[PDB]
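Retro notes, structure queue

What went well: the backlog is down to a handful. What didn't: a couple of records were mislabeled last round, so from now on we paste the full input next to the output in the thread. Example, using psiv capsid n-terminal domain from Microcebus murinus:
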Amino acid sequence: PVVNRGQGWAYEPMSTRTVAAWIRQTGEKGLTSPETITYWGLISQDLSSREQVQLLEVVPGLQADKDMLGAYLEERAREWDAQPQQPLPYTSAHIRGLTGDQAFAISAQGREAAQVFRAWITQGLMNLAQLRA
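Corresponding output:
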């Protein structure tokens, strides 16, 4: 996560425990349940965009949901990059954790872009849950 413990914004590695817990959550309650969506929102609040990609990636199985979420995030990415504003604050690649380094992640822009991605994923999971209900 990217945290500020009084010394300034710093990156700290996600623990194995954290990633394993997330893996288990998705294993027991799937990706699009009210439970997993709530779990997502909490665990992701201080994560970099890269850390968010990483969690979606380690989710075992649930291919259909992961493909549908991926297609949703791609469309959100296209819409972002198609906005009429030069210069955009960052690209969808930055938002989605596909580019930008650790300095970027701790930067104000990086932290904002990570909050955008976090909301994109939350909304996509909700959108997916609504197809099934």
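Agreed that this is the format going forward. Reviewer comment attached to the example: The radius of gyration is 15 Å.
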